[PDB]
C-alpha cells in the first residue's frame, strides 16, 4: 500500500519515523536528518507514538470546583481530577467527577 508503516507518518511523499509518547515533531525527517522530537511543553501530553507538531491539552482540576488532581498531568498521560478532601461529588460526567461540594 501507499500508506506509511505504523511507526511512521507521511510528510508529502516521504514516510518519517514517529515521535515516542511524551514528544512532538519539531523537525520532519529528510535525507540528512531524522525526525527531531521535543518533549511536550508543561500542561500538555501525548499518550501515543505520533507525528503531530502539538501535544493535547491536559485536563485542569479547578480547586474552585472542589477538585484536586488525583493523577498529575505528565508528558505521556492526561491529568485525572477527583474531589478535594472534605468534599463530595455533586456532578458525575461518565467515569469522572466534574464538581465537588464541601
Swiss-Prot record:
Extracellular topological segments: 1-102
Give expression by tissue: Widely expressed, with the highest expression in lung, spleen and thymus. Expressed in a subpopulation of B cells and monocytes. Expressed in naive T cells.
The reported result of mutating residue 23 to A is: Abolishes cis interactions with BTLA
Query: Localized where?
Result: Cell membrane
The post-translation modification note in this UniProt entry reads: N-glycosylated.
Glycosylation-annotated residues = 72
Start and stop residues of the TNFR-Cys repeats: 4-37, 40-81
Task: Kindly list the cysteine pairs connected by disulfide bridges.
Answer: 4-15, 16-29, 19-37, 40-55, 58-73, 61-81, 83-100, 89-97
According to its UniProt entry, the function of this protein is described as: Receptor for four distinct ligands: The TNF superfamily members TNFSF14/LIGHT and homotrimeric LTA/lymphotoxin-alpha and the immunoglobulin superfamily members BTLA and CD160, altogether defining a complex stimulatory and inhibitory signaling network. Signals via the TRAF2-TRAF3 E3 ligase pathway to promote immune cell survival and differentiation. Participates in bidirectional cell-cell contact signaling between antigen presenting cells and lymphocytes. In response to ligation of TNFSF14/LIGHT, delivers costimulatory signals to T cells, promoting cell proliferation and effector functions.
Quaternary structure (record): Interacts with TRAF2, TRAF3 and TRAF5. Interacts (via CRD1/TNFR-Cys 1) with CD160; this interaction is direct. Interacts with LTA and TNFSF14. Interacts (via CRD1/TNFR-Cys 1) in cis and trans with BTLA; the cis interactions inhibits the trans interactions. (Microbial infection) Interacts with herpes simplex virus 1/HHV-1 envelope glycoprotein D.
- Domain notes for this protein: The cysteine rich domain I (CRD1/TNFR-Cys 1) is required for interaction with BY55 and BTLA.
Family to which this protein belongs: Belongs to the tumor necrosis factor receptor superfamily.
Report what the protein is called.
Tumor necrosis factor receptor superfamily member 14
Q: Which residues of the full protein are shown?
A: 39 to 140 of 283
